[PDB]
């Protein structure tokens, strides 16, 4: 019923139209440190502490910064599904004739 | 909220309270502080004003004040310990604009950490119609207004509008977060009626003559298309003078009477009443 | 027709749909309006004595 | 009064601030247009009405 079509004399038959949308993000900030004094690096047995307190840092933020995009990605599910009959979070039971 | 900071001079430890609270153990009241500091919401805490009251008193003598030289400046060995009511952190916020057509499922999700367990949530919603205010989500109805994911399922015109939660622990802590629903209509339903906000019934009443009243129109059936509104002036312009930009409507009254002005898009009349008092 | 109209007023361009909004309407001309310092005329009559 | 004065020991003492403010202006557009015939042109007594 719909199919564009035109005859011999093409007049003004056929029109369409387009559309946009938009999306927004936002942006936060985050930090940590620590504290030392000079003689528990110089009177120390290990020589590199500083290299593996730094490492160690770089590492926890690596994995700080995982969680976070984790927990956002789940935050934002276009669609939400419950197992079972359960129609809440509240609902959701592992008790009863039907566990979720 | 307004909190209370303690000092122990030889323990260096600061005790933030609250308001009613106190201590006994030899520590000096030093002042007080507004947390959320109402203007600056996200860029101080709790820090930077114990920071800030401490810099007034003296090393020596917590109790009295002294110049620079002879303040409490170094923060370094300074603990500050807390025993006020925790404040709720908001983890994650509803997305401020949410679009959609009619026919499908819309879901918002809200993360609420902090304060005493257990939470309670509750839903609220507003109507995009001037003159709607937030109603609760009804929780027989549906039953995911209870908790924190609250999922619609076939909305529709009527459902467009603004949704709100609300937090709430034992203690009283509140959060709340905000988010729009937009639904596109393929063939938007015919305006059958206009209605207004700031009543059509005396409008705002001001003595001042410069003053000018603000009035918003809108229609009742849902997803309806107002077109361009057109003003009539009516008997009195003496009594007020009416001014139409777009859709907002500007009334300044002249002369302390009573009038009435008529607002309509071509095809329908909204009747507004004026009241103007000396 | 594909039209501008005025995205101020509350009016929107067509290819704009209900969620969607023009992201730049106006234009910053990144120069700025200065004000000139004052004029002093008690400052040059003094004389300056070394201390 | 108010002046900025300062001791031997000066420690957060004196602070100030500052503002700025914005303007704007607008575009519009005119035109206008006439219109004639071949016949008007060749048969006119006048000859360079264009």
Redesign the interface.
């Known amino acids: 019923s719909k199919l564009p079509l035109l005859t011999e004399n093409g007049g003004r038959v056929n029109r369409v139209?387009?559309?946009?949308?938009?999306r927004?993000g936002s942006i936060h900030k985050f930090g940590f440190f620590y504290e030392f004094t000079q003689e528990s690096i110089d009177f120390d047995s290990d020589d590199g502490l500083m290299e593996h307190l730094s490492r160690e840092l770089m590492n926890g933020a690596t994995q700080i910064t995982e969680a976070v995009l984790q927990?956002?990605l789940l935050?934002?599910?276009?669609?939400?599904l419950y197992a079972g009959a359960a129609?809440?979070?509240?609902?959701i039971t592992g008790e009863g004739s039907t566990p979720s | 909220p307004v909190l209370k900071v303690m000092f122990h001079k030889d323990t260096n430890v600061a005790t933030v309270l609250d308001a009613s609270g106190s201590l006994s153990d030899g520590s000096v009241e030093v002042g007080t502080f507004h947390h959320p500091d109402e203007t600056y919401p996200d860029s101080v805490t709790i820090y930077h004003g114990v920071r800030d009251l401490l810099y007034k008193r003296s090393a020596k003598d917590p109790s009295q004040t002294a110049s620079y030289p002879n303040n409490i400046i170094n923060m370094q060995v300074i603990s500050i310990d807390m025993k006020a009511t925790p404040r709720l952190i908001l983890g994650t916020a509803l997305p401020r604009v949410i679009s959609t057509i009619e026919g499908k499922d819309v879901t918002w999700h809200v993360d609420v950490a902090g304060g005493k367990a257990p939470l309670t949530y509750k839903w609220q919603f507003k109507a995009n119609t001037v003159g709607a205010a937030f109603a609760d989500i009804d929780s027989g109805e549906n039953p995911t207004a209870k908790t924190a994911t609250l999922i619609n399922h076939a909305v529709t015109a009527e459902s467009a509008g603004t949704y709100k939660v609300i937090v709430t622990d034992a203690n009283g802590t509140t959060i709340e977060s905000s988010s729009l629903l937009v639904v596109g209509v393929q063939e938007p339903p015919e305006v059958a009626s206009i209605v207004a906000y700031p009543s059509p019934l005396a409008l705002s009443v001001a003595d001042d003559i410069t003053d000018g009243k603000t009035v918003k129109f809108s229609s009742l059936p849902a997803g309806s298309l107002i077109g361009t509104l057109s003003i009539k002036t009516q008997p009195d312009s003496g009594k007020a003078t009416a001014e139409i930009s777009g859709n907002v409507l500007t009334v300044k009254p002249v002369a302390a009477g009573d009038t009435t002005v008529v607002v309509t898009n071509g095809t329908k009349e909204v009747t507004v009443t004026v009241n103007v008092t000396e | 027709m594909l039209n501008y109209n005025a995205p101020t007023d509350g009016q929107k361009s067509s290819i704009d749909g209900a969620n969607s909004d023009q992201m730049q309407t106006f234009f910053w001309l990144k120069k700025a309006i200065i004000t000139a310092r004052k004029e002093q005329y008690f400052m040059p009559l003094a004389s300056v004595t070394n201390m």
């Open positions: 139209g387009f559309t946009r949308i938009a927004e927990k956002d935050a934002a599910a276009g669609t939400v129609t809440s979070d509240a609902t």
